[PDB]
Amino acid sequence: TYIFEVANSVGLTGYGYTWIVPSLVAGDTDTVPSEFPTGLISVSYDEWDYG
Amino acid sequence: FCIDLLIKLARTMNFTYEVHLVADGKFGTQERVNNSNKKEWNGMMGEL
Amino acid sequence: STIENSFVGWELEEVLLLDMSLDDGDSKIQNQLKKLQSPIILLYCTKEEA
Ligand SMILES: *[C@@H]1O[C@H](CO)[C@@H](O)[C@H](O)[C@H]1NC(C)=O
Ligand SMILES: *[C@@H]1O[C@H](CO)[C@@H](O)[C@H](O)[C@H]1NC(C)=O
């Protein structure tokens, strides 16, 4: 949360800025903190197709 | 060449014109205007 | 006028207008402050703005 706060305070949400984070960093997909920038990409396990 | 080229242009798109040659007879580029502090054009595009 | 009067190959990076009457003005200013890479900056302000 602090990292995203710093990033969007400096202005790291511009074009071309692609962010890739693992499942531990992003936590749970349903819980979306307000610090999450638009177009944020994460990597996790198959939670939808792999029931 | 330019004379009959412009007459062909006048025949095509129907304009009126005058023709005359330049005084200094020179192309013109960015040069200092009589050892001043200004670099400007001269010649055809200088007066254009 | 003078920088193009001398036709040598200058390089003007950016020109900045600052708004201190708005608190969000500084946050807006941060975007172009991110574009600060030239080692020399020409300043225009008063002392309190300085
Ligand atoms: C070009 O065509 C126009 C339209 O008919 C005509 O009035 C004119 O005489 C021609 N050229 C000029 C400008 O004299
Ligand atoms: C050349 O230009 C200067 C101004 O920059 C003027 O004072 C001077 O009289 C001019 N001389 C000629 C020959 O044009």
PDB file of C-alpha atoms and ligand atoms in Angstrom:
ATOM      1  CA  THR A   1       0.000   0.000   0.000  1.00  0.00           C
ATOM      2  CA  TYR A   2       2.824   2.405   0.866  1.00  0.00           C
ATOM      3  CA  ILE A   3       4.680   1.447  -2.322  1.00  0.00           C
ATOM      4  CA  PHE A   4       1.667   2.208  -4.526  1.00  0.00           C
ATOM      5  CA  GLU A   5       1.098   5.434  -2.588  1.00  0.00           C
ATOM      6  CA  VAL A   6       4.654   6.575  -3.325  1.00  0.00           C
ATOM      7  CA  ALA A   7       4.391   5.440  -6.953  1.00  0.00           C
ATOM      8  CA  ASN A   8       1.191   7.352  -7.699  1.00  0.00           C
ATOM      9  CA  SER A   9       2.377  10.363  -5.693  1.00  0.00           C
ATOM     10  CA  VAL A  10       5.456  10.638  -7.911  1.00  0.00           C
ATOM     11  CA  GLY A  11       3.368   9.894 -11.006  1.00  0.00           C
ATOM     12  CA  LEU A  12       4.386   6.381 -12.049  1.00  0.00           C
ATOM     13  CA  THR A  13       0.909   5.669 -13.480  1.00  0.00           C
ATOM     14  CA  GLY A  14       1.666   7.056 -16.942  1.00  0.00           C
ATOM     15  CA  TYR A  15       1.657   5.304 -20.286  1.00  0.00           C
ATOM     16  CA  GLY A  16       4.000   2.361 -20.752  1.00  0.00           C
ATOM     17  CA  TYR A  17       4.348   1.890 -16.986  1.00  0.00           C
ATOM     18  CA  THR A  18       3.540  -1.823 -16.676  1.00  0.00           C
ATOM     19  CA  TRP A  19       3.723  -3.442 -13.235  1.00  0.00           C
ATOM     20  CA  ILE A  20       3.950  -7.192 -12.602  1.00  0.00           C
ATOM     21  CA  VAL A  21       3.567  -8.467  -9.036  1.00  0.00           C
ATOM     22  CA  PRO A  22       3.235 -11.997  -7.597  1.00  0.00           C
ATOM     23  CA  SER A  23       0.276 -13.284  -5.604  1.00  0.00           C
ATOM     24  CA  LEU A  24       1.872 -12.462  -2.240  1.00  0.00           C
ATOM     25  CA  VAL A  25       2.335  -8.788  -3.140  1.00  0.00           C
ATOM     26  CA  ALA A  26      -1.214  -8.349  -4.448  1.00  0.00           C
ATOM     27  CA  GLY A  27      -2.841 -10.478  -1.744  1.00  0.00           C
ATOM     28  CA  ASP A  28      -6.345 -11.570  -2.700  1.00  0.00           C
ATOM     29  CA  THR A  29      -7.856 -10.546  -6.029  1.00  0.00           C
ATOM     30  CA  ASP A  30     -11.255  -9.620  -4.575  1.00  0.00           C
ATOM     31  CA  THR A  31      -9.704  -7.169  -2.096  1.00  0.00           C
ATOM     32  CA  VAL A  32      -8.670  -4.212  -4.261  1.00  0.00           C
ATOM     33  CA  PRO A  33      -6.972  -1.400  -2.303  1.00  0.00           C
ATOM     34  CA  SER A  34      -7.596   2.134  -3.526  1.00  0.00           C
ATOM     35  CA  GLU A  35      -3.845   2.521  -4.129  1.00  0.00           C
ATOM     36  CA  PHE A  36      -4.049   0.068  -7.045  1.00  0.00           C
ATOM     37  CA  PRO A  37      -3.310   1.911 -10.314  1.00  0.00           C
ATOM     38  CA  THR A  38      -5.367   1.344 -13.430  1.00  0.00           C
ATOM     39  CA  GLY A  39      -3.937  -1.360 -15.662  1.00  0.00           C
ATOM     40  CA  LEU A  40      -2.194  -3.226 -12.833  1.00  0.00           C
ATOM     41  CA  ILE A  41      -1.060  -6.741 -13.759  1.00  0.00           C
ATOM     42  CA  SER A  42      -0.456  -9.562 -11.279  1.00  0.00           C
ATOM     43  CA  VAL A  43       0.457 -13.254 -11.424  1.00  0.00           C
ATOM     44  CA  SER A  44      -1.167 -15.892  -9.220  1.00  0.00           C
ATOM     45  CA  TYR A  45      -2.569 -19.418  -9.303  1.00  0.00           C
ATOM     46  CA  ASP A  46      -5.606 -20.552 -11.288  1.00  0.00           C
ATOM     47  CA  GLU A  47      -8.511 -19.655  -8.997  1.00  0.00           C
ATOM     48  CA  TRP A  48     -11.327 -19.570 -11.587  1.00  0.00           C
ATOM     49  CA  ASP A  49     -10.743 -22.309 -14.177  1.00  0.00           C
ATOM     50  CA  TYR A  50      -9.047 -24.643 -11.661  1.00  0.00           C
ATOM     51  CA  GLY A  51     -11.740 -25.066  -9.036  1.00  0.00           C
TER      52      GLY A  51
ATOM     53  CA  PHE B   1      11.411  26.286 -68.610  1.00  0.00           C
ATOM     54  CA  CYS B   2       9.778  28.230 -65.794  1.00  0.00           C
ATOM     55  CA  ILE B   3       8.109  30.550 -68.306  1.00  0.00           C
ATOM     56  CA  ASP B   4       6.229  27.883 -70.228  1.00  0.00           C
ATOM     57  CA  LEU B   5       5.682  25.971 -66.985  1.00  0.00           C
ATOM     58  CA  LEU B   6       3.774  28.912 -65.511  1.00  0.00           C
ATOM     59  CA  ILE B   7       1.923  29.491 -68.774  1.00  0.00           C
ATOM     60  CA  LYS B   8       0.853  25.837 -68.594  1.00  0.00           C
ATOM     61  CA  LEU B   9      -0.244  26.413 -65.003  1.00  0.00           C
ATOM     62  CA  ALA B  10      -2.181  29.500 -66.128  1.00  0.00           C
ATOM     63  CA  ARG B  11      -3.801  27.450 -68.879  1.00  0.00           C
ATOM     64  CA  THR B  12      -4.770  24.751 -66.379  1.00  0.00           C
ATOM     65  CA  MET B  13      -6.090  26.714 -63.393  1.00  0.00           C
ATOM     66  CA  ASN B  14      -6.589  30.123 -65.063  1.00  0.00           C
ATOM     67  CA  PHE B  15      -4.663  32.720 -63.072  1.00  0.00           C
ATOM     68  CA  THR B  16      -3.191  36.118 -63.926  1.00  0.00           C
ATOM     69  CA  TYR B  17       0.477  36.836 -63.380  1.00  0.00           C
ATOM     70  CA  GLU B  18       3.509  39.060 -63.751  1.00  0.00           C
ATOM     71  CA  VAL B  19       7.139  38.080 -64.297  1.00  0.00           C
ATOM     72  CA  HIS B  20      10.345  39.909 -63.400  1.00  0.00           C
ATOM     73  CA  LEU B  21      13.877  39.042 -62.370  1.00  0.00           C
ATOM     74  CA  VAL B  22      15.424  39.743 -58.972  1.00  0.00           C
ATOM     75  CA  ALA B  23      17.832  42.631 -58.426  1.00  0.00           C
ATOM     76  CA  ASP B  24      20.772  40.976 -56.655  1.00  0.00           C
ATOM     77  CA  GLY B  25      20.527  37.717 -58.608  1.00  0.00           C
ATOM     78  CA  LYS B  26      21.263  35.408 -55.708  1.00  0.00           C
ATOM     79  CA  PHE B  27      19.671  32.478 -53.897  1.00  0.00           C
ATOM     80  CA  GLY B  28      19.671  33.721 -50.301  1.00  0.00           C
ATOM     81  CA  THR B  29      20.207  32.022 -46.917  1.00  0.00           C
ATOM     82  CA  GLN B  30      20.698  32.889 -43.239  1.00  0.00           C
ATOM     83  CA  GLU B  31      23.449  35.505 -43.379  1.00  0.00           C
ATOM     84  CA  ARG B  32      24.435  38.443 -41.217  1.00  0.00           C
ATOM     85  CA  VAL B  33      22.677  41.675 -42.188  1.00  0.00           C
ATOM     86  CA  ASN B  34      25.628  44.028 -42.781  1.00  0.00           C
ATOM     87  CA  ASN B  35      27.741  42.843 -39.814  1.00  0.00           C
ATOM     88  CA  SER B  36      24.795  43.424 -37.465  1.00  0.00           C
ATOM     89  CA  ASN B  37      23.560  41.068 -34.735  1.00  0.00           C
ATOM     90  CA  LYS B  38      20.886  39.495 -36.966  1.00  0.00           C
ATOM     91  CA  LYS B  39      21.017  36.450 -39.278  1.00  0.00           C
ATOM     92  CA  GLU B  40      18.169  36.631 -41.811  1.00  0.00           C
ATOM     93  CA  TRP B  41      17.290  35.552 -45.352  1.00  0.00           C
ATOM     94  CA  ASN B  42      17.944  37.280 -48.667  1.00  0.00           C
ATOM     95  CA  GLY B  43      17.263  36.637 -52.326  1.00  0.00           C
ATOM     96  CA  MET B  44      14.035  35.094 -53.586  1.00  0.00           C
ATOM     97  CA  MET B  45      12.793  33.773 -50.260  1.00  0.00           C
ATOM     98  CA  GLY B  46      14.298  36.831 -48.584  1.00  0.00           C
ATOM     99  CA  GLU B  47      11.718  39.018 -50.295  1.00  0.00           C
ATOM    100  CA  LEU B  48       9.079  36.266 -50.405  1.00  0.00           C
TER     101      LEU B  48
ATOM    102  CA  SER C   1      14.214  36.418 -29.210  1.00  0.00           C
ATOM    103  CA  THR C   2      17.917  36.427 -28.346  1.00  0.00           C
ATOM    104  CA  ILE C   3      18.296  32.624 -28.194  1.00  0.00           C
ATOM    105  CA  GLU C   4      17.120  32.321 -31.791  1.00  0.00           C
ATOM    106  CA  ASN C   5      18.874  35.571 -32.697  1.00  0.00           C
ATOM    107  CA  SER C   6      22.084  33.593 -32.157  1.00  0.00           C
ATOM    108  CA  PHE C   7      21.497  30.753 -34.614  1.00  0.00           C
ATOM    109  CA  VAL C   8      23.923  28.311 -32.958  1.00  0.00           C
ATOM    110  CA  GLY C   9      22.428  24.984 -31.910  1.00  0.00           C
ATOM    111  CA  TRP C  10      20.848  25.732 -28.537  1.00  0.00           C
ATOM    112  CA  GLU C  11      18.679  23.247 -26.636  1.00  0.00           C
ATOM    113  CA  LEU C  12      15.846  24.693 -24.547  1.00  0.00           C
ATOM    114  CA  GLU C  13      14.387  21.823 -22.532  1.00  0.00           C
ATOM    115  CA  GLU C  14      11.215  23.301 -21.017  1.00  0.00           C
ATOM    116  CA  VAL C  15       9.657  26.527 -19.755  1.00  0.00           C
ATOM    117  CA  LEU C  16       7.752  26.394 -16.479  1.00  0.00           C
ATOM    118  CA  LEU C  17       4.824  28.347 -15.046  1.00  0.00           C
ATOM    119  CA  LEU C  18       4.374  27.911 -11.293  1.00  0.00           C
ATOM    120  CA  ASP C  19       1.144  28.356  -9.314  1.00  0.00           C
ATOM    121  CA  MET C  20       1.728  28.621  -5.558  1.00  0.00           C
ATOM    122  CA  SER C  21      -1.752  29.973  -4.763  1.00  0.00           C
ATOM    123  CA  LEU C  22      -3.071  26.393  -5.065  1.00  0.00           C
ATOM    124  CA  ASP C  23      -1.877  23.502  -2.914  1.00  0.00           C
ATOM    125  CA  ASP C  24      -2.674  21.138  -5.791  1.00  0.00           C
ATOM    126  CA  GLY C  25      -0.559  23.469  -7.928  1.00  0.00           C
ATOM    127  CA  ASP C  26       2.605  21.945  -6.473  1.00  0.00           C
ATOM    128  CA  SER C  27       1.289  18.431  -7.124  1.00  0.00           C
ATOM    129  CA  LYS C  28       0.601  19.463 -10.719  1.00  0.00           C
ATOM    130  CA  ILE C  29       4.126  20.888 -10.838  1.00  0.00           C
ATOM    131  CA  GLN C  30       5.581  17.550  -9.752  1.00  0.00           C
ATOM    132  CA  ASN C  31       4.690  16.014 -13.137  1.00  0.00           C
ATOM    133  CA  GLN C  32       7.070  18.292 -15.038  1.00  0.00           C
ATOM    134  CA  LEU C  33       9.506  18.226 -12.125  1.00  0.00           C
ATOM    135  CA  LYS C  34       9.804  14.555 -13.059  1.00  0.00           C
ATOM    136  CA  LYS C  35      11.206  15.941 -16.348  1.00  0.00           C
ATOM    137  CA  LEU C  36      14.105  17.704 -14.567  1.00  0.00           C
ATOM    138  CA  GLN C  37      17.394  16.528 -16.084  1.00  0.00           C
ATOM    139  CA  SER C  38      19.240  19.672 -17.202  1.00  0.00           C
ATOM    140  CA  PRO C  39      22.019  20.732 -14.790  1.00  0.00           C
ATOM    141  CA  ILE C  40      21.242  24.452 -15.277  1.00  0.00           C
ATOM    142  CA  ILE C  41      17.854  26.034 -14.541  1.00  0.00           C
ATOM    143  CA  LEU C  42      16.961  29.707 -15.011  1.00  0.00           C
ATOM    144  CA  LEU C  43      14.835  30.958 -12.114  1.00  0.00           C
ATOM    145  CA  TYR C  44      12.127  33.635 -12.070  1.00  0.00           C
ATOM    146  CA  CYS C  45      10.407  34.387  -8.752  1.00  0.00           C
ATOM    147  CA  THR C  46      10.319  36.713  -5.762  1.00  0.00           C
ATOM    148  CA  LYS C  47      12.038  35.976  -2.434  1.00  0.00           C
ATOM    149  CA  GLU C  48       9.022  34.455  -0.666  1.00  0.00           C
ATOM    150  CA  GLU C  49       8.379  32.302  -3.733  1.00  0.00           C
ATOM    151  CA  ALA C  50      12.110  31.608  -3.818  1.00  0.00           C
TER     152      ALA C  50
HETATM  153  C1  LIG D   1     -11.085  30.780 -63.627  1.00  0.00           C
HETATM  154  O1  LIG D   1     -12.418  30.280 -63.632  1.00  0.00           O
HETATM  155  C2  LIG D   1     -13.326  31.207 -63.060  1.00  0.00           C
HETATM  156  C3  LIG D   1     -14.669  30.534 -62.830  1.00  0.00           C
HETATM  157  O2  LIG D   1     -15.403  30.524 -64.059  1.00  0.00           O
HETATM  158  C4  LIG D   1     -13.461  32.371 -64.021  1.00  0.00           C
HETATM  159  O3  LIG D   1     -14.404  33.311 -63.500  1.00  0.00           O
HETATM  160  C5  LIG D   1     -12.118  33.054 -64.209  1.00  0.00           C
HETATM  161  O4  LIG D   1     -12.212  33.941 -65.329  1.00  0.00           O
HETATM  162  C6  LIG D   1     -10.974  32.068 -64.452  1.00  0.00           C
HETATM  163  N1  LIG D   1      -9.709  32.726 -64.158  1.00  0.00           N
HETATM  164  C7  LIG D   1      -9.621  33.999 -63.762  1.00  0.00           C
HETATM  165  C8  LIG D   1      -9.455  34.207 -62.285  1.00  0.00           C
HETATM  166  O5  LIG D   1      -9.659  34.933 -64.547  1.00  0.00           O
HETATM  167  C1  LIG D   2      23.726  48.033 -41.084  1.00  0.00           C
HETATM  168  O1  LIG D   2      22.812  47.798 -40.010  1.00  0.00           O
HETATM  169  C2  LIG D   2      23.029  48.629 -38.866  1.00  0.00           C
HETATM  170  C3  LIG D   2      22.018  48.272 -37.777  1.00  0.00           C
HETATM  171  O2  LIG D   2      22.257  46.938 -37.323  1.00  0.00           O
HETATM  172  C4  LIG D   2      22.854  50.097 -39.265  1.00  0.00           C
HETATM  173  O3  LIG D   2      23.129  50.933 -38.139  1.00  0.00           O
HETATM  174  C5  LIG D   2      23.829  50.431 -40.399  1.00  0.00           C
HETATM  175  O4  LIG D   2      23.623  51.779 -40.826  1.00  0.00           O
HETATM  176  C6  LIG D   2      23.578  49.477 -41.571  1.00  0.00           C
HETATM  177  N1  LIG D   2      24.553  49.737 -42.632  1.00  0.00           N
HETATM  178  C7  LIG D   2      24.264  49.415 -43.909  1.00  0.00           C
HETATM  179  C8  LIG D   2      25.268  49.684 -44.999  1.00  0.00           C
HETATM  180  O5  LIG D   2      23.195  48.909 -44.177  1.00  0.00           O
END
